[PDB]
Amino acid sequence: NPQPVDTSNITIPEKLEYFINKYAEHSHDKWSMDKLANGWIYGEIYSDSSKVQPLMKPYKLLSEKEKEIYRWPIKESLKTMLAWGWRIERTREGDVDAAHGYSPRAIDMSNVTLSRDLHAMAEMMAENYHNIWAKKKKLELESKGGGNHPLLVPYDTLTAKEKAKDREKAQDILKFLQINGYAVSRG
User: Fold this and answer.
1) Which 3 state secondary structure label does DSSP give 73?
2) CA of 46: how far to CAs of 41, 50, 54, in Å?
3) Quick one: 75 exposed, middle or buried, by C-beta within 10 A (0-12, 13-18, 19+)?
4) Cβ distance 16 to 78 under 8 Å?
5) Which terminus, N or C, of the chain has the lesser number of Cβ atoms within 10 Å?
6) CB of 171 within 8 A of CB of 107?
7) Distance separating alpha carbons of residues 68 and 71, to the nearest angstrom
8) DSSP-derived 3-state class of residue 158
9) How far apart are CA 139 and CA 134, in angstroms?
10) Greatest pairwise CA separation for the chain in angstroms
């Protein structure tokens, strides 16, 4: 029985939407630099044989709904924090050779270390990623009449690596909350 919290009935305030603009830009900087590690170059058609992808374009040329391709798992994840009462408040201020196309230098995320209460928050963000995605997996396979999936088991009976595939996305939020220095606790 996956139990995610309901998210779509929640209003994120507009002061956090300026914080979404920094993290949606960082999601485009991180996604494009991993393509620059293999030499993916800006082009017309997504042909994987020619090492060419057409979305190797700057973040400024994207329109607002093209930014909602990246912002939409960002906006669902902050509503899981506001439904559970997780405080996002200002206390502190916020701080491979380059290939063709847009060439960003993203802020390094995994060298920043969370504390044991904030590892317990990525323990719940990845569990809620294990609860949003598996419930949408079960309602995908019971709407199509398909099978089941080996991640339709409880989150504590998972191994540490099957938690980590949704935790690496959950650690990119709390550490970017730590680099910008927001007081982030369970409340």
Assistant:
1) helix
2) 10, 9, 6
3) middle
4) yes
5) N
6) no
7) 4
8) coil
9) 8
10) 51
